[PDB]
Symmetry: C3
Subunit: 36 residues, 3 copies
């Protein structure tokens, strides 16, 4: 049961880290447009 | 203790899912701003 | 081990909340530009 909790936390971290990456990509595309 | 942690984990999973839905809507918003 | 699980969850909650603040700032920039 503690391993299952550890796995859920690790999967949530993975999801959020990808989320952060997609947000970084959006900000970069907006910067290219404003400076285009 | 166990139930209090599960409650917070479930709330965090729901928050991260809503976080993704917002990010997808902003992506469409940026695309429209560039396309105009 | 339990304390480490609690510490991980709290760090993930703080990270998602910082994520939300950054998304809100991006949304405000997109709203300002699309109606400006
Ligand atoms: O504040 C500035 O420097 C940038 C220049 C392009 C749009 N805004
Ligand atoms: O960020 C600021 O300080 C101002 C107040 C709203 C619009 N920009
Ligand atoms: Cl601009
Ligand atoms: Hg998140
Ligand atoms: Zn175990
Ligand atoms: Zn276009
Ligand atoms: Zn708008």
């Amino acid at each position: 049961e503690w391993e299952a909790l550890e796995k859920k936390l690790a999967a949530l971290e993975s999801k959020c880290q990808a989320x952060e990456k997609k947000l970084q990509a959006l900000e970069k595309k907006l910067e290219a447009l404003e400076h285009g």
